[PDB]
Design goal:
SARS-CoV-2 Spike Protein Trimer; 0% strand; viral protein; 0% helix; part of a larger assembly; binds 2-acetamido-2-deoxy-beta-D-glucopyranose; Spike glycoprotein; 2 chains; 43 residues
Amino acid sequence: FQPTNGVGYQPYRVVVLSFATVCGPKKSTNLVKNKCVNFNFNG
Amino acid sequence: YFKIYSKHTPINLVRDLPQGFSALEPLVDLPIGINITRFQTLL
Ligand SMILES: *[C@@H]1O[C@H](CO)[C@@H](O)[C@H](O)[C@H]1NC(C)=O
């Protein structure tokens, strides 16, 4: 695991995961009042 | 999802439950996946 090795055979700064207990993060907009709009609140 | 719904009220009697109505409100809602078939009280 030496730092002098080329990034193929050198040590792995590497990891993996599956995406309920947790999910990917929701975005959000401004709360656009009074206009006719499409909306999502909490899904 | 394991659940707890809960309530507090004043009373004045130990030896019977009250002939009066008040609903219980959620405080735990956790997707723990553990089934339940037994329990014991702590006091
Ligand atoms: C709960 O019961 C199901 C069968 O109905 C079983 O497959 C599952 O493994 C049980 N849960 C746990 C935490 O073992």
